[PDB]
C-alpha cells in the first residue's frame with residue numbers, strides 16, 4: 019500500500035471563523051498543518067493588533083491538546099486603517115501579512131477599501147517594512163461578468179500596483195485562471211500564488227451540469243476547463259512560487275443549500291489527500307512536497323517544518339456531514355471515496 | 362395606471378408535471394393562457410397516444426371551471442419510436458408536435474430519421490431542446506455547438522421540416538433564427554430576457570434562477586431582448602415554467618427549472634416596455650405562435666395593469682412548498 023512521506027505541511031490560506039464554528043473546524047487543520055494563514059474576514063473584521071491578538075488566543079484555545087499548530091494572523095485592509103497600527107502588528111509578530119479584498123466605493127471605511135489608490139499610504143508602509151500583501155484578485159463592478167472578474171483584476175489593478183510598488187511582495191490568492199497562472203509564472207521573485215484543491219480538481223461543469231452544486235460554489239468562481247488545466251500544469255511544472263492554500267471556508271448547511279447560497283468549500287478535512295491525487299494524475303509527485311511544505315515558507319521567509327507526515331493510498335470514505343452546535347457542516351467531497359489519506 | 366389590452370396569450374413551451382404538483386400548477390396557466398404546449402418529459406415519458414390521452418385528461422380534470430384552457434400535447438421522441446404511433450397520434454389530434462431531447466432522450470438524429478422524415482411529410486412541427494451533452498463540452502457552449510453539429514445539418518437534410526428552436530439563450534441562436542427561413546422559429550422564456558448568469562451567481566448562488574439551458578453572458582441576454590423587440594415574427598412566448606419542490610431546488614444538487622407561470626406574462630411586459638417595444642408585445646404573446654403552428658389566434662382579450670403586484674414568497678404543496686420565480690419580489694405589470 020503506497021506511501022508518501024512529506025515534511026509537515028502548512029495552509030497558506032484559511033478561514034477559521036469564530037465562536038462555535040471555530041471550535042469545530044480548528045482541529046481539521048491543526049492535526050495536519052504546522053501553520054496556517056488565518057484570514058481576517060470576521061464580522062467585524064480583524065483590523066487592529068488587539069483584535070488579532072484576541073482572535074489568535076481563541077484559535078489557540080480550540081486547538082486539541084498535543085497538536086503543534088501555530089496560527090499566523092492577518093490584517094484586513096480598510097480605507098480607515100492606520101499605517102502605524104499595521105506596522106506595529108507586523109513588528110510585534112502579530113500580523114504575518116495583510117489581505118486586500120476587492121474594492122467597492124460603497125464599502126464602509128471600517129470594513130474595506132474604496133480603491134487601491136485610496137490606500138497607498140498603507141501599501142507603501144508594507145513595501146517599506148517587507149510585509150507581504152495577499153490579494154483576493156477580483157474587480158466587483160456590476161457590469162463585469164463573474165467569470166471575467168479575475169482577468170480584469172490582473173490588468174486594471176494587479177499590474178498597475180506592482181508596477182508602482184516594485185519592492186512589494188504579493189501573493190495572488192486562490193488563482194483560478196490561465197490568465198493568473200501565466201501572469202504568476204512570468205512574474206518575478208516578489209510574486210507568488212496559492213491554489214485550492216477545488217480549482218485543481220474541478221471546473222464549472224462540475225458545479226452546473228446535471229444540477230446546481232452549491233458546495234462547489236466558492237469565490238473566485240470555478241472557470242472553464244482550459245483554466246483548470248492551466249492550473250494543474252502550473253503546479254505539475256514544479257514552479258516554486260505556487261503553494262498550498264486551501265481557502266477552507268466553512269458555512270452551516272442551511273446557508274449553503276438556500277435560495278442564496280454562501281460561497282466557500284469546507285475542504286480542510288480532505289484538501290491534502292486531494293492535492294496528492296492531483297499531483298499523481300499529473301505524474302508530478304516529485305513536486306508535491308515543495309508545494310505543500312517548502313514554497314510557502316521560502317516566499318514568506320519562514321522555516322520549513324522539520325517533522326514529517328505520511329499519506330497512504332488507502333481509499334477512505336469522506337463523512338456525509340460534521341456536527342456543529344446548531345446545524346451541520348457538509349465537508350468538501352462529502353460521502354465520496356478519497357484516494358489518499360493521512361496515516 | 363397604464364393598462365395594456367392584448368389578445369389572450371398562449372404558452373408554446375410548458376411543464377405541467379403530474380399528480381399533486383399538476384393540480385397546484387395548472388391554474389396559474391389555465392387562468393391566463395388559452396392554450397399551452399405541454400411537454401412530455403414525465404417519469405416515465407409520454408411516448409404513446411394512450412399515455413397522452415390520459416395525460417391530457419389528468420390536465421383537464423385540474424382546470425378550474427370557468428377557465429377556457431386547451432392543453433396541446435407532445436410526443437417524447439425516442440430512438441426506437443415507431444413513426445406510425447407518432448403519426449396516428451397526429452392524425453387523431455392528440456399530438457400537436459414532437460419534442461427532441463438529446464440523451465442526457467434521443468441518441469442521434471440518424472437513429473430517428475424515419476420518424477423525422479415522417480414528421481416532415483405530414484407537416485408535424487419538431488420542437489428541439491438544442492444542446493449537445495458530451496462531457497467534454499463546457500455547459501455554456503452546448504447551445505452554440507448544437508447549432509453547427511445538429512440543427513443546421515438536420516435542416517439541410519429535411520428542407521421542409523418545421524422546427525421550433527425552444528428556449529433560446531444565445532446570440533448564436535438569436536442570429537441563426539433571425540436569419541433562418543419560414544420553417545424555423547423559436548421560443549424565449551422570461552428569465553433569459555430579464556437576467557444573465559451574473560444574477561444566478563453574484564452575491565450568492567441562486568438555485569431558483571438555475572435552469573436549462575443555462576443563463577449566459579449579458580451579450581447573449583442583450584441579443585435576445587433585441588430579437589423580441591425588433592418585431593421578428595417567428596419568436597413567441599414559451600415560458601418553460603418548470604416547477605420543482607423547494608427542497609429539490611435548495612439542496613446539495615438543485616434541479617434545473619424556473620417556476621415562472623405565475624409571473625411570466627407581467628415579466629415579458631416589463632421587458633418589452635423597457636425595450637420601447639410594447640407594440641410588438643401582443644404578437645409575441647398571442648399571434649406569432651399560432652401563425653407558426655397554423656392555428657387560429659384566440660378570440661378573447663385580457664388586460665395588464667402597470668400596478669406593482671408582489672410575488673408570493675411560496676406556494677403550498679401537499680409536502681414542502683413551491684417557490685415562484687421572483688418570489689417576494691415586485692413585478693411591475695399584473696393581469697387585471
Ligand SMILES: O=C(O)c1[nH]c(=O)[nH]c(=O)c1F
Pocket residue numbers: 033059154235236237238267281282283
Ligand atoms: O470567507 C468566505 O466565506 C469566502 N468564501 C469564498 O468562497 N471566497 C472568499 O473570498 C471568501 F472570503
Ligand SMILES: O=C(O)c1[nH]c(=O)[nH]c(=O)c1F
Pocket residue numbers: 376402490571572573574603617618619
Ligand atoms: O423539465 C425540467 O425540469 C427542465 N428544466 C429545465 O430547466 N430545462 C429543461 O430542458 C427541462 F426539461
Ligand SMILES: [Zn+2]
Pocket residue numbers: 154191192237238
Ligand atoms: Zn478570497
Ligand SMILES: [Zn+2]
Pocket residue numbers: 031032033057265267
Ligand atoms: Zn479566502
Ligand SMILES: [Zn+2]
Pocket residue numbers: 490527528573574
Ligand atoms: Zn428544454
Ligand SMILES: [Zn+2]
Pocket residue numbers: 374375376400601603
Ligand atoms: Zn422545457
